[PDB]
Amino acid sequence: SVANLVDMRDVSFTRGNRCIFDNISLTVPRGKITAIMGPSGIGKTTLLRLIGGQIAPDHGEILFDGENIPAMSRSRLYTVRKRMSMLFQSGALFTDMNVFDNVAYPLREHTQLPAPLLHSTVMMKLEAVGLRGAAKLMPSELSGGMARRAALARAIALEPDLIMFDEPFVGQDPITMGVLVKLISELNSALGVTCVVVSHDVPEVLSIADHAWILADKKIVAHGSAQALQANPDPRVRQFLDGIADGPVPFRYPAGDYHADLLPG
Amino acid sequence: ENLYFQSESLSWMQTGDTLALSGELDQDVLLPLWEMREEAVKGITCIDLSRVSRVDTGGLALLLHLIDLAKKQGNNVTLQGVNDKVYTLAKLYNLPADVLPR
């Protein structure tokens, strides 16, 4: 078996005349939750599209379960994509179908399972998102939060090995925000789904993540636990997390080597 | 009476009052158990999942339908050997008490 479901090694990406990523390397450990954070417009969505093989990197290797995606043939890529699901914010629901049929579409297209069971499954997945009573409603009849939540419910319908969420918590009240955080956590726990979460709702995503990566100035500036980041003195990391420049380090007393604390000698 | 079905990824066995499952309760492999649901739940008071390694949402829906069809016959059904991840999945979907024994 392979420890990192996604393994980016020395990846660079340039769009037109402007550089987006400069020789970055990160890992998405299998069965865990990885958060990817950073200032707006730095191309985190582009990073997710890179992992999904939708875009190709200029240089470097993107290993999915060991296989270099940019080096894969098209048929091989098509079959490997079946283990992935991506929720984009630009993506929209089918306007001609209601909420229920929108969430049922992936299941009817790839699940090939009995209609009573499919019905129960779509009802459960609507309950996980708080839209069960809105099954009949059309997308035009939906508010922003409801529509985003419906897109999310469709994104988790097939429960593949890897799910990538692009800002799953935006446009929601804080209680619904917590409900969605719980959704990602319990999905990962019960099914072993490897989750990559892109979010500027930093406390929320850090409350569930196993690993976190911060991106700035076309590179990776930090990674580690929430405790590690709270004790990181780097001005860019502090500027992003605290929102203010030249503020204090919240965890003022940094910690020593953890392996040495646990296993002295 | 004693029923036995085995496949590569899913097997089940009805001994007397207990239906015991083995393998993966996944959307691709669960179909045979759906097809013989009424036979599998006939005069059973217990479902044993001790030997089940994985249950996805489709498998959980199958499980709920089995519990429902079993009780319709007049049999309240107990659950045994349930992996904690199954109850986490039930928690995710807020399953009521009358649908799944805790």
Residue numbers in the entry:
A (entry chain A): 4 to 268
B (entry chain B): -4 to 97
Paper text:
An ABC transporter is a critical component of the Mla pathway, which is a phospholipid transport system that is important for outer membrane (OM) integrity in many Gram-negative species, and has been implicated in the Maintenance of outer membrane Lipid Asymmetry. Two copies of MlaF, an ABC ATPase, and two copies of MlaE, a multipass transmembrane protein, form an MlaF2E2 subcomplex that represents the conserved ABC transporter core. MlaB is stably associated with the cytoplasmic part of the transporter complex: one MlaB subunit binds to the side of each of the two MlaF ATPase domains. We and others have hypothesized that MlaB may regulate the MlaFEDB transporter complex, perhaps through its interaction with the MlaF ATPase. Here we report structures of the MlaFB complex, and present a model for how these two proteins may work together.
